[PDB]
Write a protein that binds this ligand. Sequence first.
Ligand SMILES: [Cl-]
Length: 583
Amino acid sequence: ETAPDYALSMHGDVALPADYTHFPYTNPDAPKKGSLTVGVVGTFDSLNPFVLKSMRTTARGLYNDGEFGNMVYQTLMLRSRDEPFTLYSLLAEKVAIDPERKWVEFTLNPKAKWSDGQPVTVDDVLFTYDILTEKGRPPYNSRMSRVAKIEKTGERSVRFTFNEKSDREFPMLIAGSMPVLPKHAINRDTFGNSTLEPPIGSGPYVVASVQPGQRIVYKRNPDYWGKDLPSQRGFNNFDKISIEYYRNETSLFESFKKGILDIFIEGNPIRWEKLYDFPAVEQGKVIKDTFEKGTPADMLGFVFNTRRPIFADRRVRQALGLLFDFEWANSNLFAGQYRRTQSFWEGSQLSSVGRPADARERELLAPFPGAVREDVMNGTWHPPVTDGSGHDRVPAKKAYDLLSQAGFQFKDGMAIDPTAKPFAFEIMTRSPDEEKIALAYQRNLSRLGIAVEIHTVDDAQYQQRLQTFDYDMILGALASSLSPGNEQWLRWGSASRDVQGSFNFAGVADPAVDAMIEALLAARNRADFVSAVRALDRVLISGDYYVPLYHLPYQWVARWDRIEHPQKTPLSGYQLPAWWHTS
Ligand SMILES: [Cl-]
């Protein structure tokens, strides 16, 4: 009775009422003529995103695409990019669901059609779970291990009943992380092969041409079945989208400058600052756009391997963390473009930084009295801000005092560890960019008498060492989101510390961490969830497992002025599928 029939939200929060006319970040009257040409670094030679063969060389744009979403293969429900985790109607016109999430039932829209004009049916859905289970790659072949029964319940209705291996997130994955495939158009015996035959989907774009290693051209189907859905209003505005493939970023950038590519998505701060001094920018023909987003910025940090005795003591990790001089690095290496990262959910509502712990967090954390530092609990903690000099005496004195409390001596002019050895460790780096930042950190550590070796290892040997946790310190990245879930166990869970190949690079094993992961998974409403995640953040910060580095505070997209976008930018940042070509 309480469940909407037109939406499915992970934690029950649904921003749009049933009669919405469009997602709030689209222009409901966007022009519909003209093309978009974008570049990517890499290659492709196949057109099946759901199978092992050629999985690393599959064309962009078909399904699960970061910039373009699902242009050929569609899901039952469509994710809004203005909410943390809410899905709205797409192939499924209606949804019904068990309060306890033991079953979910979808009713297909009777207008739904494949691009060849055949109907999308319940039989296509059943076929989809059959063939992907038998012949798909992970994760697409793993869904049925959670499903007790899949059955047709009406002319256009299908119900999934789940088994005890399922969890509250699982129905979300059925609704939004599986395609629907066309039974009538797929040769089952060859499904799985590398293929360059244009595949049939229900999406708005068809594959018009394919030049392997070079270019895929999508054309809009004028008879696209979903064109009038409120969930599609102001999307799919380009009548043609070409994705071109380049061997490196410089080649790609040059092709943008020549007007062959319409946009350039920029992540390099030196390039953004220095290299957009070409005439088109000065004439206003190329616009440097910036956007903000409320999804978190991915963590980048130095990672302490807490398994090594040198780094077992959190007080030592805390001291060494204070010595990184971000303000010097930003100013001298990065043209001031970065902002300091402080939280594992940086820039989002899930960050604990600058927020006193709420009543729910304090309840959750009370059984773990040592787990969160007072400054972190009260929201007064931040990493040091230096004078930018590269030799600021203030964080260094705090570091010196902490190491002394932890048993260090200083005897000229070395830092001596509690076992009476001169303190020394290695930073394993993978690239010249990593070396450059490690070198900067090394200069500050050396000023306290600490000897640091920087050792660059090629990619394959680097991964061999990651696998066995064979390092003192590395640089580590995390793919963050507004919906942390089961993946948190392999990052931070105490069982993952001793599993070779896990993602727990710091070797975290703390019942408080485990308990906060349990709590965020148990949360059934967005308030409890936010509280639990913040509490996880507080514990992780208080362990000094990472020395958090930096992130870009704006998204950057340069564009020829023949490309436009809505004034509004949603929670997830810019959304290319809502952009259009000027008249
Ligand atoms: Cl995350």
